[PDB]
Structure formats: structure tokens, C-alpha cells
């Protein structure tokens, strides 16, 4: 199964391995047991070149794993700014919600990734999106005492 | 796999 | 009497070196270990932190630890670097790459018994050991992972001694690693169970003070550590000079810790100064008092007025009216009485020490046990939970043989800690 | 005939220093024990070289305070073996003083006391000085009192106990320590003089014009009052001439054994040319709450006993008239089952003050010792602070971790509740 191999290659950042596997018919949209695709894993572990390559060859930019995470969720959570922007450029849903009611804005906010927050906002992130406890990203910043975040989130 | 600290283990110090 | 000091990991050794620089100057000890001051107050309790070899030259009772070898060199090349006992440097070859599992289990465990041998030796040459103080970050792998391992081993071997830590809490504003909430939660779990007193030093608070108050547009670790060293000097003043109140670690603990798990202190001090300018004027006693209780002067990022004080210690340093101190301390207590728990009568103790810190004629140090510290743990918890729900980088930990259930155990313990603070926050005398 | 004084913990030791300082001045004894050239031989033994040595033991679990005695002005007055120290103190924790750390040194203390007791031909008993608040003053004292009760069952034991005040307090748990030691000492003590640090503090600020009193200020005043109380033991006299008589005169009812001391006049040393106060004036001043060693209101209570101990130029007929005056000016209600007769002792020697103390010389002074149900207000104040913390079990783990059962808190507290009802029942109105 070249799928399992593409998955591990995408996580490890083995660019060359990725190329060969796809050339031999490896499923670009293969899933592991939790429903993570090679684009999820590349987006998670910060492999920008592998992200762009998967996206040039049929990767679903908005694929969800079993917990509803999209690649954009994971990039925003881990804080890979260039990857966030590539995902957005290729049609990532800025307002995708996962099984906890989190949007990519929530995750970037919680983790303090302020550049990513500004970018998401510019691309139409929903400042009124509530998680399953009813919190918006703005609620999180004021419950947090994170004044820098709260100001960014307020900018008209 | 490595055994780990449990909740409340430090409460024995005072009994 | 004696305290044995341990500093672990990069952060631990950096603020640790700064502490030794600062109290050495206060005590009149130069980098070669010779005393050169003109006050007998300086030497009266020198034995608390210093071994006295012949002669008459003083050596820090300090053990210096890191898995990263490079940390050796930076400490040594520091101003007071030569004063430490060469045999008390205990270091590894690699080090943990921000992996708490590496620190604790894998790589710390490889190092740890070497460290304990040095600890044991410092201990046996003590007339009457008080306990231990550890400086470490919670966000890395060594200070955090190995530091808490050291603590657990020391608890086993010296179960009746006080264990005190200066623990610096990670913030996204200062360091760019998203596993830091993992490492800090695993650590907080260990500290809740095994320390008697922990000063919560929040990089979030330190950064905000530097950026917003001290107007340093790009704060360095040096900027942050200037706040930490001032704080560490202040909170150990009662231990290092003659006096009535909180004069040893156990007396301090019995006064500050009403419930064994709630032993995380919020430190503050006044005045806050940027290193290298300028001066003064000296504060008045009212000015000191009001600033030392001000949220902006806290080293933990919590608003004290969002919770209630269980216990408070306040240390005034320098020449000043003891009567004016008493009046102001009474003042802040009864104008703000709703902020001090009513079911712990007289829960604010005040010390005065006549020797001011360097550069100052008057200063105040605040030590609070406040229910508001739950804001710090809620912040870590929220970041922990964001990462742990997506199981990001978990294999990096389990790869060192760590149980995943340890993550869940630590998380639950920390959330329990938060609930407990809230319970006493809402408690009433009635 | 002999009395042995025992000083425990920092407060007991420092007040002890002040007392023996004054005792030497009163009996004409130098800091090396020599006397330039019989009564005081109850408090001082005598060597063959004419050296007079206090019948006194100083004990602390930590050495700082006693090391000052060992190196100070009276470094040669005491038996050096009667200055006893551990290395690790009780950390403001009754349980450490009583159960852990105290057990380490209790046998040495008793053997050293035995050595003093063996030099006596007719030991009356012990005077014990300690704080309520410290772990040593509270915990070790009650351990010592227990053991002294087994080893000297026939002897009298008197206490001078320092009752805590927030102005000079150093621990949050002092109400715990106070009630714990009172519970376990009540049975073993025959008579106990409480010294409220707040009452002494106030007198220093008000009568001595000391802006911020130190322990050195408090202690010299306290020692002047202790000296008034023990003078009858150290001189010829007709009132309270031995420890047994203290209990007879001041304690008719064994659990209510806490007399109130009131002292006058207290005059600033800066006022060396104050016009002298009359017997009438100083006697009246004894029923002013401002001059009491414990803060409480005796007009709210009833008297069970009353002793007036005069020092100096005091004519007996003038005391009787002054007493007649107060018995018909003033509301002094005695209980119906005791003689309403004030007992009077007069010592004709002018009172002594320590040079460089805050007190002026006076020609006449009086200490009144009265057993009044009003002192239960002091207990109620401690009990209330106890209840606030204990409701939450605040700090209780410190005690349970050091050899003490949690049940001992509620047992001590119930005993306190019983003590308060004893006062209510005696003060029948
Ligand atoms: N205040 C302050 N924080 C520091 C300093 N150095 C590092 N930190 C913080 O410490 C945290 C953990 O880093 P380290 O101490 O460097 O990690 P380590 O203990 O050396 O462990 P490893 O490097 O993973 O082996 C991060 O949050 C940093 O922001 C410092 O000098 N001052
Ligand atoms: N009047 C007076 N009170 C004192 C003195 N020293 C301490 N106190 C009071 O005593 C109480 C504290 O007890 P200490 O006597 O210091 O403690 P300790 O007996 O030494 O016990 P540990 O130190 O806990 O082992 C507080 O209420 C203090 O204000 C003193 O010299 N004079
Ligand atoms: Mg490092
Ligand atoms: Mg003491």
C-alpha cells in the first residue's frame, strides 16, 4: 500500500519520497485510521513544499479527519503561517468547524499565533463563531486577559 | 511503559 | 539553617546565575568568594546560602545541571562563574529538545543519579539542612522534565525537608514552541504533588511588564531576567537576614499554605525599573504599598482583584518609618477587605529589613497566595487541551516510553487545582 | 521554700532575661552573681565563693535567642548547663513542639531540671514563662508541663503566658497553638497569668509615648509587672508568701485559674519630676481597664478574688481608706460565695526600675491581682479566630503531618467551650 507510505513520508517531510510515491499511483487523498490525509500531516508538521505539491496533485484542501479537523485547523493550531496562507490560496474554508466547535480562528487565538489571527481575519474568519462552550475567539481573549489579541480581534 | 505520578500521592506527606 | 540550591536547564541556570550575582553583591561577596562589605548584618546568616571554606572564602551551596553541555560554558564565562564548586557542574551530552519525556525518563534518568550524588554531598556537610530551592522553566524538557524528576527523587530521600521552586511559566509571547503547554502541564502535575512552595514566575507577565510598562519594544531574556532577579532577591530576604517573620522556609510555608495543594505564589515588587535607567526618586511608603499590590507589578499574569487572598507576605526594604508601614498595611487591608478571605484572620504578615537592594533606597516585595492564580492555570490548561485534543506531537512523548494516560492524569490534576482555588474563592465565613 | 523558673521559646526566654535583670537589681546582685558586703535565696542558690545563681532554666528548640543570653551582659549569671538549645525549631506549629522536635530534647531538659531540684531542700514548684503563639512556647511547654506533673505531682506550677496580638504577630496559626496548649496545660497548671501583647503594646504607646513598641519595650514593662507579682516570694511579707498561697488567694475554683493583673502607675522616664501619686490615686487606677495586662471589661463581670500588692511609701490606713472609697464609689460585684475582702500586701521598698528603661522612678506602685469572669472575653476572642479557620480546616494538615490527630482540634475546642461556660455559670448573672 503506497498510501500508508505517502502518509508517513508526508509527516516526515521526505520530499523526494513523496514525489516517487505519487508517480507510482499513491493515493494523494489516502487516510490513516483517524482519517488524517497526507495534507493534514504535512500541514501539521510544517512541511510547506510538501503541502504545495500535494495541492498541485489533487489533494482535498478541506478534507476532515474523524474529529472534523481540516488542514487549516492544524496549520492554525501549530502556527505555520506560510502554510496557512497557501491553504487559504487554494480554497481552504476559513470558517470550518470541528467536532469541538472550534474554527481555525479559535485555535490560532488560543495558541497566541497573532500573525495567523490577522491573516484569518482578513480572509473572512467569523468573529461571532462560538465553540461548544459558547465562546468566540474574542471571548477567549478577554477571559484570557490577552490584550494584544483582543485588540487585533476588534480591529474594524 | 513508564509508571507515573497519580493525583493525590503528595497528600500522604501530611498523614 | 542551610539551603541547597539547584538550577536546571537553560532558563534555570540563567535566572539561577542572576540570583547568585544579586545576593552575592547584597552580602558583600565578590566573584572570588572574598567578603568585602561593611555591615555585620551581611554575614550573620551567610551560611544559609553559602558554604564557608578556608579562608575566609565563601562558596555558593549550588548545584548546576543541564542535559545541554553548552550551558556549562555560559555560566562559567559569567561574572561570578568561577565561584561555583567545579565538581557541582553536572551535565549531559545532548539534551532534551523541549521534550519533557526525554528530560524525565530518558535522558534525565540517565543523568539524575550523578546529580543526586552531588546533592547528597552538599547535604551531609550541612549543620542542619532546611531544604532545597530549584530554579527551572516549565516549558522546556530539562528544567521541566528532569527538574521534576530531581524533585521526586529528593522527596524520597529527604521527605522531611522543605522543597521550594522558582518555576517560570511559558508564554506564546516569548517562546515559539507549541509543545510548551504539554511540558508545563506535566510539570505542574509534579509540583502540585511534590513541592511545598512554588513561586509562579510568568513569562507572560514579564514580557507585558517589559513591553507595556518599561516600554521595551523588543524585550530580551536579559530584560525579563532583570525582573526575575529583583523578585528572587526580594522573596528570599527574610531567609538571608536576621528577623522575626518567615525567617526560614518552613515558617514561611506554615504562614502561606493553608491547604497543601494550594502553594503557588504570586510575587510582585516595587518599584519596577528598566535596567540602566534611571533612579528615583525614592518612593514613599504609601507609594510602595500601593504599587506592590498593583496587578501591573505582579510576576504572574493574573488580576489579583479577580480573586481573593488566602495569605500574603510583604517585605519592606530600606530605611523607613515602621509606624508608617504599619498604618499603610492596615489601610490596604480594610479599604479592600473584601479581597482578603475573612475566615483566615490576620492573614497578611509584614516584614521590614533595613538593607535595601542595589540601586535603591527603598523597595517592597509582595508574596501572595491568591485564588486569582487559577487564571494562570486556566490559560495553560486551555492551550494544553487545544493541542492534546488533536493529539499533536504525542508520539514524540510516547516514543520515550511515556504513558499517554500520564497526560490525562496531569490535565485532570491541574483542572482539579483550578476548581479548588474557585471553591475557596467563593467560600464564606457565615 | 525554693522556686524554679523555666523559660520556654523566644518569648519566654526574652521576658526571662528582663525579669532576672530586674531581680538582680532588686536584690543587689551583679551580673556575675556577686553581692557587695536570706529572702531571695528562694530564687537564687549560693555557691561557696559568694556567687548567687538564679534557679532558672532557659530552653529553646533553636539557638538564636539563648545564644544572646550566653554571650551577653548576664553571660556569667546563669548555670551554663541550664541554657539549653536544639538546632531546629517548631516552625510555629504546636505539634512540632509537642510531638516531634520537642521529643528530641525533653529528656535532657528534665534531667537538667532534676539537677536544680536536687539542690533544693524544700522545693515549692515552678514558674513557667512561654508564649501561646509559637510552636515551642505552646507545644513544648505543654509537653514539659505534662512530664513535670508526673515527676513532681505535689509541686505547684504557675504560668506567665504571652497572649497573641496582631501588632507583633508572626504566625497566622497562633489561635490554633493557643487553644491547643491551653487544653493540654489546664489540668497541670495551678494558676496562670496571661499577658496580652496588645494590652502591653497600648500602654507603651499611651503611657510611655513609644511610637512603635519593640519586644524590648514590651518586655521591660512585662518584667516590672512580673516582679510585682513574684516579689512576695522573694521578700518578707504577709500575702502570697509561697506558691500554694497564690492558688488559695486567687483560684477558688480550679479550672478558672486565670487572674487579671492591673498595674499602676506607668509613667514615662522623660517625666522624672512628675508629682507623686497618692495611695488613693494608684489604687483607683487599678480599676481602670486601660491599665490591665489583658484587654477585657471587669465591670461586665464578677470578682471571685482580689489582691492588692503595694510597693514603696504606702501607709496601711491609707490603703484601707482608699479601698473603702472604691467599694462605695465603684461598681465592683463579687460573687455571693466568697469574702469580698481585698487582701493587702505591702512591700515598703521603693519600686526598682532598670536604668535606660522607659519607666520613671516612682515612690509608690501597686499591682492588683483579681480573678474576674471578665477575662473570658479574652478566651472568646481567641476561640472565634480558631473557629473561622477550623471551619475550613485551614492549616490543619501541618499539625496532622507532625504527630497529631485531627480529633485533638475539636477536643481542645470543646474544652475551651466548657471553660467559657464555667465563667458564665460562676458569673451567675
Ligand atoms: N524568563 C526567562 N525565560 C527563559 C529563559 N530561557 C529560556 N526561557 C524560557 O524557558 C522555557 C523552556 O526553555 P529551556 O529552559 O530553555 O529548556 P531546557 O530546560 O534547557 O530543556 P531543553 O532545552 O529542551 O533540553 C521557554 O518558555 C523559554 O521562553 C530565560 O533566560 N529567562
Ligand atoms: N512580649 C513578647 N512577646 C514575644 C516575644 N517574642 C515573641 N513574642 C510573641 O510570641 C509569639 C510567637 O512565639 P515565639 O515565642 O516567638 O515562638 P517560639 O516559642 O519560639 O516557638 P517557635 O519559634 O515556633 O519554635 C507571638 O505572639 C509574638 O509576638 C518577646 O520577646 N516578648
Ligand atoms: Mg536547553
Ligand atoms: Mg522560635
GROMACS .gro file of N, CA, C and O in nm, chain C residues 323-417:
model
  380
  494UNK      N    1   0.623   5.271   6.173
  494UNK     CA    2   0.485   5.307   6.206
  494UNK      C    3   0.406   5.341   6.081
  494UNK      O    4   0.287   5.311   6.072
  495UNK      N    5   0.471   5.406   5.984
  495UNK     CA    6   0.402   5.439   5.860
  495UNK      C    7   0.374   5.312   5.779
  495UNK      O    8   0.272   5.302   5.709
  496UNK      N    9   0.465   5.216   5.787
  496UNK     CA   10   0.444   5.086   5.725
  496UNK      C   11   0.321   5.020   5.785
  496UNK      O   12   0.235   4.969   5.712
  497UNK      N   13   0.310   5.023   5.917
  497UNK     CA   14   0.201   4.955   5.985
  497UNK      C   15   0.068   5.019   5.945
  497UNK      O   16  -0.026   4.947   5.912
  498UNK      N   17   0.063   5.152   5.945
  498UNK     CA   18  -0.058   5.224   5.905
  498UNK      C   19  -0.100   5.193   5.761
  498UNK      O   20  -0.219   5.173   5.734
  499UNK      N   21  -0.005   5.189   5.669
  499UNK     CA   22  -0.042   5.167   5.529
  499UNK      C   23  -0.088   5.023   5.506
  499UNK      O   24  -0.186   5.000   5.435
  500UNK      N   25  -0.019   4.928   5.568
  500UNK     CA   26  -0.059   4.788   5.556
  500UNK      C   27  -0.198   4.767   5.618
  500UNK      O   28  -0.278   4.691   5.565
  501UNK      N   29  -0.228   4.835   5.729
  501UNK     CA   30  -0.362   4.826   5.786
  501UNK      C   31  -0.461   4.890   5.690
  501UNK      O   32  -0.570   4.838   5.669
  502UNK      N   33  -0.420   5.002   5.631
  502UNK     CA   34  -0.502   5.074   5.535
  502UNK      C   35  -0.548   4.986   5.419
  502UNK      O   36  -0.668   4.974   5.393
  503UNK      N   37  -0.454   4.925   5.349
  503UNK     CA   38  -0.490   4.849   5.229
  503UNK      C   39  -0.579   4.730   5.266
  503UNK      O   40  -0.667   4.692   5.189
  504UNK      N   41  -0.562   4.676   5.386
  504UNK     CA   42  -0.642   4.561   5.428
  504UNK      C   43  -0.789   4.594   5.455
  504UNK      O   44  -0.877   4.516   5.421
  505UNK      N   45  -0.817   4.709   5.515
  505UNK     CA   46  -0.956   4.736   5.550
  505UNK      C   47  -1.031   4.824   5.450
  505UNK      O   48  -1.153   4.836   5.458
  506UNK      N   49  -0.959   4.886   5.356
  506UNK     CA   50  -1.025   4.955   5.246
  506UNK      C   51  -1.064   4.852   5.140
  506UNK      O   52  -1.161   4.871   5.067
  507UNK      N   53  -0.988   4.743   5.135
  507UNK     CA   54  -1.008   4.637   5.037
  507UNK      C   55  -1.042   4.504   5.102
  507UNK      O   56  -1.005   4.399   5.050
  508UNK      N   57  -1.113   4.508   5.214
  508UNK     CA   58  -1.130   4.390   5.299
  508UNK      C   59  -1.195   4.274   5.225
  508UNK      O   60  -1.172   4.158   5.258
  509UNK      N   61  -1.275   4.305   5.124
  509UNK     CA   62  -1.347   4.201   5.053
  509UNK      C   63  -1.253   4.115   4.969
  509UNK      O   64  -1.293   4.012   4.916
  510UNK      N   65  -1.128   4.159   4.957
  510UNK     CA   66  -1.032   4.086   4.875
  510UNK      C   67  -0.945   3.993   4.958
  510UNK      O   68  -0.864   3.919   4.905
  511UNK      N   69  -0.960   4.000   5.090
  511UNK     CA   70  -0.888   3.911   5.180
  511UNK      C   71  -0.988   3.820   5.246
  511UNK      O   72  -1.084   3.865   5.307
  512UNK      N   73  -0.965   3.690   5.232
  512UNK     CA   74  -1.052   3.589   5.289
  512UNK      C   75  -1.081   3.617   5.437
  512UNK      O   76  -0.989   3.648   5.513
  513UNK      N   77  -1.208   3.610   5.476
  513UNK     CA   78  -1.249   3.654   5.610
  513UNK      C   79  -1.226   3.544   5.712
  513UNK      O   80  -1.217   3.570   5.832
  514UNK      N   81  -1.217   3.421   5.664
  514UNK     CA   82  -1.202   3.305   5.751
  514UNK      C   83  -1.054   3.269   5.775
  514UNK      O   84  -1.024   3.164   5.829
  515UNK      N   85  -0.962   3.356   5.735
  515UNK     CA   86  -0.825   3.347   5.783
  515UNK      C   87  -0.786   3.481   5.843
  515UNK      O   88  -0.726   3.565   5.775
  516UNK      N   89  -0.820   3.502   5.972
  516UNK     CA   90  -0.793   3.628   6.042
  516UNK      C   91  -0.645   3.663   6.037
  516UNK      O   92  -0.561   3.572   6.046
  517UNK      N   93  -0.614   3.791   6.019
  517UNK     CA   94  -0.477   3.839   6.025
  517UNK      C   95  -0.387   3.765   5.927
  517UNK      O   96  -0.281   3.716   5.966
  518UNK      N   97  -0.428   3.758   5.801
  518UNK     CA   98  -0.360   3.671   5.705
  518UNK      C   99  -0.252   3.743   5.626
  518UNK      O  100  -0.191   3.685   5.537
  519UNK      N  101  -0.228   3.870   5.660
  519UNK     CA  102  -0.123   3.950   5.599
  519UNK      C  103  -0.009   3.979   5.699
  519UNK      O  104  -0.029   4.051   5.796
  520UNK      N  105   0.109   3.923   5.677
  520UNK     CA  106   0.222   3.949   5.765
  520UNK      C  107   0.320   4.044   5.697
  520UNK      O  108   0.343   4.035   5.575
  521UNK      N  109   0.378   4.135   5.775
  521UNK     CA  110   0.468   4.235   5.720
  521UNK      C  111   0.607   4.228   5.784
  521UNK      O  112   0.620   4.228   5.907
  522UNK      N  113   0.709   4.221   5.700
  522UNK     CA  114   0.847   4.226   5.748
  522UNK      C  115   0.915   4.353   5.699
  522UNK      O  116   0.885   4.403   5.589
  523UNK      N  117   1.004   4.407   5.782
  523UNK     CA  118   1.091   4.516   5.740
  523UNK      C  119   1.236   4.469   5.751
  523UNK      O  120   1.274   4.406   5.850
  524UNK      N  121   1.314   4.498   5.648
  524UNK     CA  122   1.457   4.471   5.651
  524UNK      C  123   1.529   4.598   5.609
  524UNK      O  124   1.487   4.668   5.516
  525UNK      N  125   1.638   4.627   5.678
  525UNK     CA  126   1.694   4.761   5.680
  525UNK      C  127   1.789   4.784   5.561
  525UNK      O  128   1.815   4.898   5.520
  526UNK      N  129   1.837   4.675   5.502
  526UNK     CA  130   1.926   4.681   5.387
  526UNK      C  131   1.849   4.676   5.255
  526UNK      O  132   1.789   4.575   5.219
  527UNK      N  133   1.854   4.787   5.180
  527UNK     CA  134   1.781   4.794   5.053
  527UNK      C  135   1.853   4.714   4.944
  527UNK      O  136   1.970   4.680   4.961
  528UNK      N  137   1.783   4.680   4.835
  528UNK     CA  138   1.853   4.617   4.723
  528UNK      C  139   1.934   4.720   4.646
  528UNK      O  140   1.913   4.840   4.661
  529UNK      N  141   2.026   4.671   4.564
  529UNK     CA  142   2.117   4.755   4.487
  529UNK      C  143   2.044   4.858   4.402
  529UNK      O  144   1.946   4.827   4.335
  530UNK      N  145   2.093   4.981   4.406
  530UNK     CA  146   2.038   5.088   4.324
  530UNK      C  147   1.924   5.161   4.391
  530UNK      O  148   1.877   5.263   4.342
  531UNK      N  149   1.879   5.109   4.505
  531UNK     CA  150   1.759   5.162   4.566
  531UNK      C  151   1.779   5.196   4.712
  531UNK      O  152   1.866   5.141   4.780
  532UNK      N  153   1.697   5.290   4.759
  532UNK     CA  154   1.697   5.326   4.900
  532UNK      C  155   1.577   5.260   4.966
  532UNK      O  156   1.580   5.233   5.086
  533UNK      N  157   1.473   5.236   4.887
  533UNK     CA  158   1.351   5.175   4.938
  533UNK      C  159   1.283   5.086   4.833
  533UNK      O  160   1.270   5.123   4.716
  534UNK      N  161   1.239   4.969   4.877
  534UNK     CA  162   1.170   4.877   4.788
  534UNK      C  163   1.080   4.785   4.868
  534UNK      O  164   1.097   4.769   4.990
  535UNK      N  165   0.983   4.725   4.799
  535UNK     CA  166   0.884   4.640   4.862
  535UNK      C  167   0.871   4.514   4.781
  535UNK      O  168   0.869   4.519   4.659
  536UNK      N  169   0.859   4.400   4.849
  536UNK     CA  170   0.832   4.275   4.779
  536UNK      C  171   0.704   4.212   4.831
  536UNK      O  172   0.677   4.209   4.951
  537UNK      N  173   0.624   4.164   4.737
  537UNK     CA  174   0.495   4.107   4.767
  537UNK      C  175   0.497   3.957   4.741
  537UNK      O  176   0.547   3.912   4.637
  538UNK      N  177   0.445   3.879   4.834
  538UNK     CA  178   0.422   3.738   4.809
  538UNK      C  179   0.277   3.707   4.839
  538UNK      O  180   0.233   3.717   4.955
  539UNK      N  181   0.202   3.667   4.737
  539UNK     CA  182   0.061   3.640   4.756
  539UNK      C  183   0.021   3.496   4.728
  539UNK      O  184   0.068   3.435   4.632
  540UNK      N  185  -0.063   3.441   4.815
  540UNK     CA  186  -0.135   3.319   4.783
  540UNK      C  187  -0.276   3.361   4.752
  540UNK      O  188  -0.357   3.377   4.842
  541UNK      N  189  -0.304   3.382   4.624
  541UNK     CA  190  -0.432   3.435   4.579
  541UNK      C  191  -0.508   3.335   4.494
  541UNK      O  192  -0.447   3.267   4.411
  542UNK      N  193  -0.639   3.326   4.513
  542UNK     CA  194  -0.722   3.237   4.430
  542UNK      C  195  -0.719   3.279   4.282
  542UNK      O  196  -0.758   3.201   4.194
  543UNK      N  197  -0.672   3.400   4.255
  543UNK     CA  198  -0.670   3.452   4.118
  543UNK      C  199  -0.565   3.379   4.033
  543UNK      O  200  -0.566   3.391   3.910
  544UNK      N  201  -0.475   3.306   4.099
  544UNK     CA  202  -0.370   3.233   4.027
  544UNK      C  203  -0.432   3.123   3.939
  544UNK      O  204  -0.365   3.068   3.852
  545UNK      N  205  -0.559   3.092   3.961
  545UNK     CA  206  -0.628   2.997   3.875
  545UNK      C  207  -0.632   3.043   3.728
  545UNK      O  208  -0.644   2.961   3.638
  546UNK      N  209  -0.622   3.174   3.705
  546UNK     CA  210  -0.616   3.228   3.569
  546UNK      C  211  -0.492   3.181   3.496
  546UNK      O  212  -0.497   3.152   3.376
  547UNK      N  213  -0.379   3.175   3.566
  547UNK     CA  214  -0.259   3.119   3.507
  547UNK      C  215  -0.282   2.973   3.467
  547UNK      O  216  -0.253   2.933   3.353
  548UNK      N  217  -0.333   2.892   3.558
  548UNK     CA  218  -0.352   2.751   3.524
  548UNK      C  219  -0.463   2.728   3.421
  548UNK      O  220  -0.456   2.633   3.345
  549UNK      N  221  -0.564   2.815   3.416
  549UNK     CA  222  -0.668   2.801   3.314
  549UNK      C  223  -0.611   2.828   3.175
  549UNK      O  224  -0.651   2.765   3.076
  550UNK      N  225  -0.517   2.922   3.168
  550UNK     CA  226  -0.453   2.958   3.041
  550UNK      C  227  -0.371   2.841   2.986
  550UNK      O  228  -0.385   2.804   2.868
  551UNK      N  229  -0.286   2.783   3.072
  551UNK     CA  230  -0.206   2.667   3.033
  551UNK      C  231  -0.299   2.554   2.993
  551UNK      O  232  -0.280   2.492   2.891
  552UNK      N  233  -0.401   2.531   3.075
  552UNK     CA  234  -0.496   2.423   3.052
  552UNK      C  235  -0.565   2.432   2.915
  552UNK      O  236  -0.588   2.331   2.848
  553UNK      N  237  -0.599   2.553   2.875
  553UNK     CA  238  -0.673   2.575   2.751
  553UNK      C  239  -0.584   2.544   2.631
  553UNK      O  240  -0.629   2.486   2.533
  554UNK      N  241  -0.458   2.586   2.639
  554UNK     CA  242  -0.360   2.556   2.536
  554UNK      C  243  -0.328   2.407   2.536
  554UNK      O  244  -0.315   2.346   2.430
  555UNK      N  245  -0.315   2.349   2.654
  555UNK     CA  246  -0.289   2.205   2.665
  555UNK      C  247  -0.399   2.128   2.594
  555UNK      O  248  -0.373   2.038   2.513
  556UNK      N  249  -0.523   2.163   2.628
  556UNK     CA  250  -0.639   2.093   2.575
  556UNK      C  251  -0.653   2.113   2.423
  556UNK      O  252  -0.690   2.020   2.354
  557UNK      N  253  -0.624   2.233   2.372
  557UNK     CA  254  -0.626   2.257   2.228
  557UNK      C  255  -0.532   2.161   2.156
  557UNK      O  256  -0.570   2.099   2.057
  558UNK      N  257  -0.410   2.148   2.206
  558UNK     CA  258  -0.311   2.056   2.146
  558UNK      C  259  -0.346   1.909   2.170
  558UNK      O  260  -0.345   1.828   2.076
  559UNK      N  261  -0.380   1.875   2.293
  559UNK     CA  262  -0.400   1.734   2.327
  559UNK      C  263  -0.522   1.674   2.258
  559UNK      O  264  -0.524   1.555   2.228
  560UNK      N  265  -0.624   1.756   2.229
  560UNK     CA  266  -0.742   1.704   2.158
  560UNK      C  267  -0.710   1.659   2.015
  560UNK      O  268  -0.772   1.566   1.963
  561UNK      N  269  -0.612   1.723   1.952
  561UNK     CA  270  -0.575   1.686   1.816
  561UNK      C  271  -0.456   1.590   1.819
  561UNK      O  272  -0.406   1.550   1.714
  562UNK      N  273  -0.412   1.557   1.940
  562UNK     CA  274  -0.303   1.461   1.966
  562UNK      C  275  -0.175   1.497   1.893
  562UNK      O  276  -0.098   1.410   1.853
  563UNK      N  277  -0.151   1.626   1.877
  563UNK     CA  278  -0.035   1.671   1.802
  563UNK      C  279   0.096   1.643   1.877
  563UNK      O  280   0.110   1.675   1.996
  564UNK      N  281   0.189   1.579   1.807
  564UNK     CA  282   0.325   1.550   1.858
  564UNK      C  283   0.327   1.456   1.977
  564UNK      O  284   0.430   1.440   2.041
  565UNK      N  285   0.215   1.391   2.004
  565UNK     CA  286   0.207   1.300   2.116
  565UNK      C  287   0.308   1.184   2.104
  565UNK      O  288   0.365   1.142   2.204
  566UNK      N  289   0.333   1.138   1.981
  566UNK     CA  290   0.425   1.025   1.960
  566UNK      C  291   0.567   1.061   2.001
  566UNK      O  292   0.646   0.974   2.038
  567UNK      N  293   0.600   1.190   2.000
  567UNK     CA  294   0.731   1.233   2.047
  567UNK      C  295   0.748   1.203   2.195
  567UNK      O  296   0.855   1.190   2.241
  568UNK      N  297   0.638   1.198   2.268
  568UNK     CA  298   0.645   1.169   2.411
  568UNK      C  299   0.637   1.019   2.435
  568UNK      O  300   0.718   0.962   2.508
  569UNK      N  301   0.539   0.954   2.373
  569UNK     CA  302   0.521   0.811   2.395
  569UNK      C  303   0.639   0.731   2.340
  569UNK      O  304   0.665   0.619   2.385
  570UNK      N  305   0.710   0.789   2.243
  570UNK     CA  306   0.828   0.729   2.186
  570UNK      C  307   0.939   0.709   2.288
  570UNK      O  308   1.027   0.625   2.271
  571UNK      N  309   0.934   0.786   2.396
  571UNK     CA  310   1.030   0.767   2.504
  571UNK      C  311   0.972   0.674   2.611
  571UNK      O  312   1.026   0.664   2.721
  572UNK      N  313   0.863   0.607   2.577
  572UNK     CA  314   0.804   0.509   2.667
  572UNK      C  315   0.707   0.567   2.769
  572UNK      O  316   0.666   0.500   2.864
  573UNK      N  317   0.669   0.693   2.748
  573UNK     CA  318   0.577   0.760   2.839
  573UNK      C  319   0.433   0.715   2.813
  573UNK      O  320   0.392   0.697   2.698
  574UNK      N  321   0.358   0.694   2.919
  574UNK     CA  322   0.219   0.655   2.903
  574UNK      C  323   0.136   0.778   2.864
  574UNK      O  324   0.155   0.888   2.917
  575UNK      N  325   0.045   0.759   2.770
  575UNK     CA  326  -0.045   0.866   2.728
  575UNK      C  327  -0.140   0.905   2.840
  575UNK      O  328  -0.185   1.021   2.847
  576UNK      N  329  -0.169   0.810   2.929
  576UNK     CA  330  -0.258   0.833   3.043
  576UNK      C  331  -0.195   0.934   3.138
  576UNK      O  332  -0.266   1.002   3.211
  577UNK      N  333  -0.062   0.946   3.138
  577UNK     CA  334   0.004   1.047   3.221
  577UNK      C  335  -0.041   1.188   3.180
  577UNK      O  336  -0.052   1.277   3.265
  578UNK      N  337  -0.067   1.207   3.051
  578UNK     CA  338  -0.115   1.335   3.000
  578UNK      C  339  -0.252   1.366   3.062
  578UNK      O  340  -0.277   1.477   3.111
  579UNK      N  341  -0.338   1.266   3.060
  579UNK     CA  342  -0.474   1.279   3.111
  579UNK      C  343  -0.474   1.297   3.263
  579UNK      O  344  -0.550   1.377   3.317
  580UNK      N  345  -0.386   1.223   3.331
  580UNK     CA  346  -0.368   1.236   3.476
  580UNK      C  347  -0.324   1.379   3.513
  580UNK      O  348  -0.379   1.439   3.607
  581UNK      N  349  -0.227   1.433   3.439
  581UNK     CA  350  -0.175   1.566   3.469
  581UNK      C  351  -0.282   1.673   3.443
  581UNK      O  352  -0.305   1.759   3.527
  582UNK      N  353  -0.345   1.665   3.327
  582UNK     CA  354  -0.454   1.756   3.292
  582UNK      C  355  -0.564   1.759   3.400
  582UNK      O  356  -0.609   1.867   3.439
  583UNK      N  357  -0.609   1.641   3.444
  583UNK     CA  358  -0.715   1.633   3.546
  583UNK      C  359  -0.671   1.696   3.677
  583UNK      O  360  -0.748   1.769   3.740
  584UNK      N  361  -0.548   1.668   3.718
  584UNK     CA  362  -0.494   1.724   3.841
  584UNK      C  363  -0.492   1.876   3.836
  584UNK      O  364  -0.528   1.943   3.934
  585UNK      N  365  -0.454   1.931   3.721
  585UNK     CA  366  -0.443   2.076   3.707
  585UNK      C  367  -0.581   2.140   3.707
  585UNK      O  368  -0.603   2.246   3.768
  586UNK      N  369  -0.676   2.077   3.640
  586UNK     CA  370  -0.812   2.127   3.643
  586UNK      C  371  -0.873   2.114   3.784
  586UNK      O  372  -0.952   2.199   3.825
  587UNK      N  373  -0.836   2.009   3.857
  587UNK     CA  374  -0.878   1.995   3.996
  587UNK      C  375  -0.823   2.110   4.079
  587UNK      O  376  -0.893   2.166   4.162
  588UNK      N  377  -0.696   2.143   4.055
  588UNK     CA  378  -0.632   2.256   4.122
  588UNK      C  379  -0.714   2.384   4.102
  588UNK      O  380  -0.740   2.456   4.198
   0.00000   0.00000   0.00000
